[PDB]
Amino acid sequence: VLYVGSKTKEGVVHDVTTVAENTKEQVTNVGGAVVTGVTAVAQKTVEGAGSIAAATGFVKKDQ
Amino acid sequence: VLYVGSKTKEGVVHDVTTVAENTKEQVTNVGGAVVTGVTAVAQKTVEGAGSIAAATGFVKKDQ
Amino acid sequence: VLYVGSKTKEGVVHDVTTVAENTKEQVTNVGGAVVTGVTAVAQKTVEGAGSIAAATGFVKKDQ
Amino acid sequence: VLYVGSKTKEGVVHDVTTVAENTKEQVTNVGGAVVTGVTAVAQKTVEGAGSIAAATGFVKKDQ
Amino acid sequence: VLYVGSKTKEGVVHDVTTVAENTKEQVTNVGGAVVTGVTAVAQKTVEGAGSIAAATGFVKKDQ
Amino acid sequence: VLYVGSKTKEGVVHDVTTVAENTKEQVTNVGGAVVTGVTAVAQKTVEGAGSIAAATGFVKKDQ
User: Impact of altering residue 14 to A (chains A, B, C, D, E, F)?
Assistant: First the structure.
């Protein structure tokens, strides 16, 4: 790999706006996984067998 | 790898705005995983078998 | 690796704004994991089998 | 008038509840009359020609 | 008028509850009359020609 | 008028509760009359021609 005058963006997250006015939430979780907010995961490389990259609201109950 | 005049962004998170006015939340968690806020995970490299990168609101109950 | 005139950002988090006006939260957690605030994790390299990088609101109950 | 064992309520206002959650108002008044709150006027007797009893949000510009 | 064992309420206001959570007001008044709060006027007798009893948010610009 | 064993309430205001949590007001008044708080006026008798009893947020600009 060789860059020359390269304005590169590679594995990036940007400009994620979020507004919320007059909200009323309520959660009742039992052993689960509830996710309500903003999530911004930026990666470039993930290796490995059986791996997990960027898991939001994930439940794993394998044997 | 060889860069020359390279304005590089690689595995980056930026400019994540979030506004919230007149909010009313309520959580009742029992053994779970509730996530409500802002989360910004930036990585570049993750190795390994069976690894987990960037897990938000995750429940793991393997055998 | 060899850089020349390289303005590099690599595994970075920046510019994460968050406003909140007239909020009313309430949490009732029992053995779980509730997360409500801002979280900014920036890394560059993580190795190892079975590792966990950047876990927010995580519950692990393996055997 | 003559009362005997008289549990009288005469010209009364009571039990006016009002709840308000996650409100966002805005008023831009110019020479007028804006009214937004609770108003409870209880009277029993008003006399007189040309009088005005219990005027809410009233504009009078006679000649 | 003659009362005997008379539990009288006459020209009364009572029990005016008001709750308000996560409010955001804004007023821009110019020569007018804006009214936003609770008002409780209790009277029993008002006489006179041209009088005004219990005026909330009133604008008078007669000639 | 003659009372005998008379538990009288006459021209009364009572029990005016008011709660307010996480409020944000703003007023910009110019020559007007803005009113935002609690007001409790209790009277029994008002006489006179051209009088004004219990005026909240009132603007008078007669000729």
Answer: Impairs copper-binding
The residue with tokens 């990259």 is: A53
List the one residue out of A7, A44, B55, A39 whose CA is nearest residue C11. A44
The last residues before gaps in chain A (C-N over 2.5 Å) are none
Q: Beta-strand (E) ranges in chain B? A: 2-4, 9-14, 27-30, 34-35, 39-42, 52-60
Torsion sign over Cα E36, E37, E42, E46: negative
Distance (Å, whole) CA C16 – CA C13:
8
Identify all chain B residues contacting C28, using CB atoms and an 8 Å cutoff: 27-29
How far is it, in rounded angstroms, from Cα E38 to Cα D4?
36
Q: Do chains A and D touch (3 or more CB pairs under 8 A)?
A: yes
Q: Single out the residue of F40, F41, D12 nearest to residue E10, CA to CA.
A: D12
- Chain B residues closer than 8 Å to D23 by CB: 22
- CB of A9 closer than 8 Å to CB of C12: no
Q: Which one, of C10, C13, C8, lies nearest residue C40 by Cα?
A: C13
Compute chain E's Rg from CA coordinates: 18
Residue A43 corresponds to which amino acid?
Answer: Q
Q: Do E39 and D38 touch (CB under 8 A)?
A: yes
Q: Assess whether chains A and F touch, using the rule of 3 or more C-beta pairs within 8 angstroms.
A: no
Separation of alpha carbons B46 and F3, rounded Å:
91
Yes or no: say if C40 and A40 are a contact pair by the CB < 8 Å rule: no
Phi, then psi, of D34 in degrees rounded to 5? -105, 135
